Every structure is written in C-alpha cells, then in structure tokens.
Design a protein around this ligand. Structure first.
Ligand code: HEM
Ligand code: HEM
Ligand code: HEM
Ligand code: HEM
Ligand SMILES: [Zn+2]
Ligand SMILES: [Zn+2]
Ligand SMILES: [Zn+2]
Ligand SMILES: [Zn+2]
Lengths: 106, 106, 106, 106
C-alpha cells in the first residue's frame, strides 16, 4: 500500500531479524522487506511533493530503494545458506541505507 | 498494474532504447522500465498459479526481477553519464535476463 | 598472474559448471572464477596498450570486470543454497558479459 | 601487494574523498580503492591464519570484499555523473562495511 505502511513493515521486520533465533525467521522477514521495498518504489514522499517525478531529488529518492533492494537480496541469500549471524549482520548494514534516505527526505 | 501491462512497458521502452539518438531518451525509458520491474515484483505468473508464494519456483521467479532491477540500475548510471552506446549495450544485456525468465515461466 | 592465464581459468571453470553433477563442483568452480576475475582487474589488454589507464576505454574495460564479479558472487550464493540448475543458469548468463567484453576489447 | 598496504591505500583514499572539492579527485580516489579492494581479495588476515581457505570465516571475510567492491563501483558511477556530494555520501556509507569487517577480523 502506501509509503508509511511499507515503512512500517520494513521496520517491524528489521526488528524481527535482530531478535531471530533461526534462519527461517530471518528468511521470512527479509522476504516481507523485499516486497515492501519493491512496493515503495513509485511513492512520492511528503517532502518531495512539490518536485517533478523527473527531478534530481526523485531520481535520488528512487536510487535509495535500488540500494536497499540489492542489500535485501544479498542478505536473503545468506539467510538461505543458513548463515544466521551473517544475515543479521547484513540486515544491520541495511540501516546505513535506511538512515541515509531518512536524513535527506524524511 | 498487472503483469502483462508491466511486460508491455518493459518491451516498449527496450525498443525505445535501441532506437534512441540521445541520452535523455535512454534515461526516460530506463526510468519507466525500473518502475515496471518494481511493480511486477509481487505478481504470480499464470504458469505458477498452482504454486505456493514460498515455493522454489516463486522464489526463483522473484529472483529474476532482482537481477533485472539491478541491471536497469546500472544501465541508468551509464545513461546519466551521457554514455549512450554503453547504456544501449547494457540494455541489450538485459535481454539475457528477459529471455531466461520467459523460457522457464512464460 | 597474467590476463591470459586468468582468462584460461575463467573458461576452464565455466565448462566445469556446465558439466557439473553436484553443487560442490559448481561452488569450487565459481570460487576459482571469482579469484581469477579479481586478479584480472588491473590488467591492460593488448588492444588498449596505447591508451591511458584513465581512458574511457580502460574505465569501460574495468567496469566489465565489476559486472562479471557481481554475477559470479550471486551465482555462488545459488550454488551454496544447493540450487544446481539455478547456479548453472546463472553461469550461462555470465557468457553475455564474457562475450560483450571480448567483442569490444579482444 | 600485501593486506596492510591495500588497507593503507583504502584508508588514504577514503580521506581524500572526504576532503575533495571536485569530481576528478573523487573519481581518482575511488579507482585506487577499487584496485586495492580487488588486490586484497585473496589475502588471509592474521586472525584467520589457522583457518582453512574454505572455512566459514574465510568465506565471510571474502564476502566483505565483494560488498566493498560493489559499493565502490556504485560510488564511482555517482562521481562520473559529477555528483560530488552524492559520491561523498556513498563513500561514507562504505565505512559501515570497513567497520563491520574490522570488528570481526581485525
Ligand atoms: C530497512 C530500511 C528502512 C526502515 C526500517 C525504514 C523505516 C521507516 C519508518 C519506521 C518510518 C516512519 C513511518 C511513520 O510512522 O510515518 C519511515 C518513514 C519514511 N521513510 Fe523509511 N525506512 C527504511 C528505508 C527507507 C528508504 C530506503 C527510503 C528512501 C529511499 C525511506 C524513506 C522514507 C520516507 C520518505 C519516510 C516518511 C514517510 C511519510 O512521511 O509519509 N525509508 N521509514
Ligand atoms: C526487459 C526484459 C523483458 C521484456 C522486454 C519482457 C517482455 C515481455 C512481453 C512483451 C510479454 C508479453 C505480454 C503480453 O502481451 O501478455 C511478457 C510476458 C511475460 N514475462 Fe516478460 N519481459 C522481460 C522480463 C521478464 C522477466 C525478468 C521475467 C521473470 C522474472 C518475465 C516474465 C514474464 C512472464 C511470466 C510473462 C507471461 C505474462 C502472461 O502471460 O500473463 N519477463 N514479457
Ligand atoms: C566468464 C567469462 C569469460 C570467459 C569464459 C573468458 C575467456 C577468455 C578466453 C578463452 C580468452 C582467450 C584465451 C587466452 O588468450 O587466454 C580470453 C581473453 C581475453 N578476455 Fe576473456 N573471458 C571472460 C571474461 C572476460 C571479460 C568480462 C572481459 C572484459 C572485461 C574479458 C576480456 C578479455 C581480453 C581483453 C582477452 C585477450 C587477452 C590477451 O590475449 O592478452 N574477458 N578470455
Ligand atoms: C574502505 C573500507 C576500509 C578501510 C578504510 C580500511 C582501513 C584499514 C586500516 C587503516 C587498517 C590498519 C592498517 C593495517 O594495519 O592494515 C586496516 C586493517 C585491516 N583491515 Fe581494513 N579497511 C577497510 C575495509 C576492510 C574490509 C572490508 C575488511 C574485511 C573484509 C578489512 C579487513 C582488515 C584486516 C583483517 C586488517 C588487519 C590486517 C593487518 O594490518 O595485519 N578491511 N584497514
Ligand atoms: Zn553476497
Ligand atoms: Zn556499473
Ligand atoms: Zn541472487
Ligand atoms: Zn547506483
């Protein structure tokens, strides 16, 4: 659905990964994050409402999702390999991307 | 919207890139493809209708979109640098990904 | 060592993947390709000997190795998950990048 | 050459990026970092000397370099586009990867 709901599922599932005991829990959480990130692709954030869909800001905004999506992808492979700690570490590294976009556009 | 519509916009814009004379045309077409690929993320193809969203087939199906999205991302950077020929070559390389998914799931 | 030798190991191991019966064989081959691709990074091809290391051609040449390295990395994740067929398909998709560089610079 | 020398050039060039006033400076520094990261690929860190090259630790160590290499690649596209501030931000995000590997293996 909307940007806020997608952001909520990203946040909820990042916390799930942080507290996870097994690979299945991490895999499920990352799958849901992948779907939320993909669904958020086309959203226009409130702070960029006055800007063109083709503006440098909107391109940069969408670029952040490219980065997040790529990171979720790789973290899911690590989880699929049963590498819980490695996948959790990869999910922690996702935060740098979360935080970078929030700093600019939230 | 639906899978078929997203595939049409992928195909339309790939052709635009092949026939393009300037970077602006390639940039615009790749941007459209990126949106279409992200929107297609969550779709269930007709041939996998009987399968679980968590089946090996559906994970592999979605994985192909991860690959496509990554390739579109890189091609847009080359287009942004004004490297028309390089971006066109990158777009041609996308076809390997198109064809690979079609052969399995179309 | 030298570009030719790295290319030999890339080609040899690609063929090993094609003929492989299990994931261990694919994993081993892809690990060898990863090392060869990384070692090839800083090589200057005969056809670009007259060009500056900072030339558009040399940047483009190195870029092709980034692409190849990224694809080997993902294919190895698939092999690590025991997805032999998927990893073999991924390795087949590597050829598009092999061929693209050879057409321009070999 | 050796791991320590590669780390020095990574560190020196990261600082250059942080203090840079032009895209050319950032481009040059990122190119050097890419070469150093590629060269570090096959190194065995002192803390993993008693481990097999096929150990989980060595796989994870090498994985960190793939991640770094991917991020340097993206950052260089941004610099090539003349987006100094975006490239500098991308280089800052590299630190997350530097720091993550150091915490585990330094
Ligand atoms: C896993 C990574 C991420 C997490 C955990 C996350 C989490 C959140 C949370 C909890 C909110 C607040 C929702 C609310 O109550 O209003 C939010 C808002 C927001 N996020 Fe993220 N986020 C992530 C990645 C990103 C990325 C990559 C972008 C941009 C590329 C982004 C852009 C935004 C924007 C623009 C808002 C404000 C939404 C609004 O006001 O409607 N986020 N995020
Ligand atoms: C740029 C690359 C691609 C192009 C140019 C392309 C093009 C097309 C076209 C023209 C159609 C027929 C649409 C119609 O009239 O019904 C189609 C269908 C389809 N494509 Fe793609 N495609 C691409 C990428 C992909 C990828 C990466 C996947 C899988 C991950 C995929 C999966 C499918 C499926 C499952 C259908 C069947 C849709 C249906 O019958 O309802 N495509 N594609
Ligand atoms: C997995 C894919 C690849 C395969 C199977 C492959 C295989 C080969 C083979 C069989 C040769 C000729 C044999 C030799 O002289 O050693 C060669 C040479 C060469 N390759 Fe590739 N290669 C691959 C990837 C690449 C990529 C991505 C690039 C560009 C970035 C590239 C650039 C070159 C160049 C410039 C030569 C000529 C070197 C010379 O003759 O001194 N190759 N490779
Ligand atoms: C751009 C990111 C990075 C920067 C700026 C950086 C910088 C440094 C510096 C300044 C040192 C101390 C000098 C030395 O003794 O080598 C060092 C050491 C080291 N780094 Fe990094 N590094 C980065 C990335 C990484 C990554 C990704 C890994 C692992 C995947 C890693 C593993 C190590 C190890 C094992 C040492 C200790 C080796 C030794 O000195 O005996 N570094 N790094
Ligand atoms: Zn990975
Ligand atoms: Zn690129
Ligand atoms: Zn993958
Ligand atoms: Zn990018």
């Amino acid at each position: 659905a909307d940007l806020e709901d997608n952001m909520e599922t990203l946040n909820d599932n990042l916390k799930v990964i942080e507290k996870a005991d097994n690979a299945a829990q991490v895999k499920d959480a990352l799958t849901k994050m992948a779907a939320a990130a993909a669904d958020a692709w086309s959203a226009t954030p409130p702070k960029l409402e006055d800007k063109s869909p083709d503006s440098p800001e909107m391109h940069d905004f969408r670029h952040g999702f490219w980065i997040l999506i790529g990171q979720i992808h790789d973290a899911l492979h690590l989880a699929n390999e049963g590498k819980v700690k490695e996948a959790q570490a990869a999910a922690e590294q996702l935060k740098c991307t979360c935080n970078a976009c929030h700093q600019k556009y939230r």
